[PDB]
């Protein structure tokens, strides 16, 4: 099965998932001088005040916080989207060192981690149907840089001990994802894919220009997680990021100049 090690890592994925070499793979490097400003682009609409978190899971590749998506509780609209997209989960990608960890890069700069807020287009009825559609998902990508602590992240950091190994989960209610957003919602956007198998090309990527700051201590706890299950040999969960893929026939658009 796939992973991020020396024998099952991203360069190997294409043997089981040939779309890995597809035309709209993610992530990509955002070249800030060739991104096109598009005034036609609307502001993002983030409506998370009614969000309902349920659970946090070590899924063996990352950890994810899951939400109730049976109704329009927490949705993303606007930006380059038509239709409304419900929040289903968020997760992170991070590095073994502060100089790497993000999936997207900006002018080849890497950040310490990257947060993905995953949303699916309600017109398709359920998540499994949405991932088979070119406009099925919208993922909000937020960069993390090491500096001052982020108060809104600490509730997450504090429960990681409880889900240290693969398949562990814990109740995680009343978490407000608004505490994870930057002040500005300016963004870049491009059509792309899931960055983990099955790598389906169903994602409208929305990557925020402004990073959020987290402390060294906060990102250190991420690095204490395990890829393995309980009772197995310990392998620390680090460097669970895919490198940049060729842009090919695509234009990155910016909502700002």
Ligand X SMILES: CC(=O)Nc1nnc(S(N)(=O)=O)s1
Task: Indicate whether 195 belongs to the interface with ligand X (CB under 6 A).
Answer: yes
List the beta bridge partners of residue 141: 116, 207
Single residue of 24, 104, 116, 168 touching ligand X by CB under 6 A: 116
* H or E segment to which residue 157 belongs: helix 154-159
- Cβ–Cβ < 8 Å for 63, 163: yes
Work out what residue 89 binds among Zn ion, ligand X, none; the CB cut-off runs from 5 to 8 Å by kind: ligand X
Q: Which two tokens stand for residue 108?
A: 């080849």
Least distance between Zn ion and beta carbon 132 (Å): 19
Parallel, antiparallel, or unpaired: how do β-strands 85-94 and 75-78 relate? antiparallel
Tokens 């790598």 found at: 199
- Indicate the residue among 73 and 215 with the shorter CB distance to ligand X: 73
Q: Alpha-carbon distance 149 to 203, whole Å?
A: 30
116 is in an annotated binding site: yes
28 neighbors 244 (Cβ within 8 angstroms) = yes
Q: How far is the CB of 91 from Zn ion (least distance, A)?
A: 6
Stretch in the footprint of ligand X (CB under 6 A) among 104-112, 161-169, 181-189, 190-198: 190-198
Distance CA 129, CA 132 (A): 6
Segment 152 to 181, residues that bind ligand X, using CB under 6 A: none
Binding ligand X (rule: CB under 6 A), the pick from 196, 204, 226, 240 is 196
Residue 24 binds to Zn ion (criterion: CB under 5 A): no
Stated length of the chain: 257
**Catalytic: 119?**
no
Of residues 89, 105, 189, 218, which one binds ligand X by CB under 6 A? 89
**Angle at Cα 168 formed by Cα 165 and Cα 172, nearest 5°?**
125
Strands 187-192 and 169-171: unpaired
Q: Is 116 in the site for Zn ion (CB under 5 A)?
A: yes
With binding defined as CB under 6 A, does residue 194 bind ligand X? Answer: yes
DSSP state for residue 241 in the 8-state scheme: -
The reply, when asked if residue 195 is annotated as ligand binding, is: yes
Residues with a known catalytic role: 61
Interaction site with Zn ion (CB under 5 A): 116
Interaction site with ligand X (CB under 6 A): 89, 116, 118, 139, 194-196
Q: Binding site residues for Zn(2+), as ranges? A: 91, 93, 116
Annotated binding site for substrate: 195-196
């Amino acid at each position: 099965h796939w992973g991020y090690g020396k024998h099952n890592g991203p360069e190997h994925w294409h043997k089981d998932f040939p779309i890995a070499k597809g035309e709209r793979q993610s992530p990509v490097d955002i070249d800030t001088h060739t991104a096109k400003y598009d005034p036609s682009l609307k502001p993002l609409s983030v409506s998370y005040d009614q969000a309902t978190s349920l659970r946090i899971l070590n899924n063996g590749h990352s950890f994810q916080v899951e939400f109730d998506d049976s109704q329009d509780k927490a949705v993303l609209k606007g930006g380059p989207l038509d239709g409304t997209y419900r929040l289903i989960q968020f997760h992170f990608h991070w590095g073994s060192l502060d100089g790497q960890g993000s999936e997207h890069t900006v002018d080849k700069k890497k950040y310490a981690a990257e947060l993905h807020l995953v949303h699916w287009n309600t017109k398709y009825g359920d998540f499994g149907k949405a991932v088979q559609q070119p406009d099925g998902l919208a993922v909000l990508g937020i960069f993390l840089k090491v500096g001052s602590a982020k108060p809104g992240l600490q509730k997450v950091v504090d429960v990681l001990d409880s889900i240290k190994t693969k398949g562990k989960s814990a109740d995680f209610t009343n978490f407000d994802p608004r505490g994870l957003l930057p002040e500005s919602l300016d963004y870049w956007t491009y059509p792309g894919s899931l960055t983990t198998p099955p790598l389906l090309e169903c994602v409208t990527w929305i990557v925020l220009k402004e990073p959020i700051s987290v402390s060294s201590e906060q990102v250190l706890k991420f690095r204490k997680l395990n890829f393995n299950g309980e009772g197995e040999p310990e392998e620390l969960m680090v460097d669970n990021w895919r490198p940049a893929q060729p842009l090919k026939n695509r234009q990155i658009k910016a909502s700002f100049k």
